[PDB]
Write a protein that binds this ligand. Sequence first.
Ligand SMILES: CCNC(=O)c1ccc(Nc2cc(-c3c(F)cccc3Cl)nc3c2C(=O)N=C3)nc1
Length: 278
Amino acid sequence: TVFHKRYLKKIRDLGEGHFGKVSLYCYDPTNDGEMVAVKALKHRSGWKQEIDILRTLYHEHIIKYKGCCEDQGEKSLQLVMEYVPLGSLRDYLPRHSIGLAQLLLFAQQICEGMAYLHAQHYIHRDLAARNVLLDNDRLVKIGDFGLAKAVPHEYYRVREDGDSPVFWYAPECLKEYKFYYASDVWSFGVTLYELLTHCDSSQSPPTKFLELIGIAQGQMTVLRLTELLERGERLPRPDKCPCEVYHLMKNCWETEASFRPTFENLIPILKTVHEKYQ
Ligand SMILES: CCNC(=O)c1ccc(Nc2cc(-c3c(F)cccc3Cl)nc3c2C(=O)N=C3)nc1
């Protein structure tokens, strides 16, 4: 379980999660070696939580935990996870014309992993394309559990103190700072919107929501976003997104949380929709 700093040579950075950098290391005990993703602390309370969460989770659509490397440089542990060089769907989809059936297999896979995460009484709180990694052409894994919390209750009371991804968030999260299982389903709807736009930047939630709100009064982007969503306005139907999928997307974006489907509801619908366009 314990990786040694001795045989752990840094190759490059992969990116920034919620607490500190994700980096590529070759772990070569032989000195002639397994390649691993290492998340590090640059906060200290939330970081300890990501370690304890991912150490509990085992699923084919959750990023593989490997171990903890006792990092003398930050007086803490680094999280060591499997390396997947294809990276995030936000990285991959803009440069690979993936067909509709494959995108729905990805969406089925996210729901299976999220169904598992809910079953273990955890919310994700940043289910976005940027946090879904591609292991291969037809397998995705959820990463970044930096904002994930244990539900005690049907929701966690979040704070304003935090790097909140407001463009992926349900009205109840934005207004009443309550995060329900049903709030992760709304985030899934936005993620599904990202998949069907091949995570095109010009088509992104922040781009499209600020296109509706504007930038003239930035101190109420949230208030304007909350009102826009309560008046029933939604991100548009992506080019070549089937009517049926957009309806499922809108069902995930139900203003009332109790009217959104659970992930266990979505799985057989996405299974069946996948089969059709295949
Ligand atoms: C710009 C090109 N992008 C890549 O070349 C690339 C390839 C693989 C990659 N892998 C990531 C990326 C993350 C990660 C991150 F760095 C920032 C935010 C969210 C996530 Cl899920 N986490 C893990 C991994 C990984 O292999 N194991 C864990 N990251 C980037």
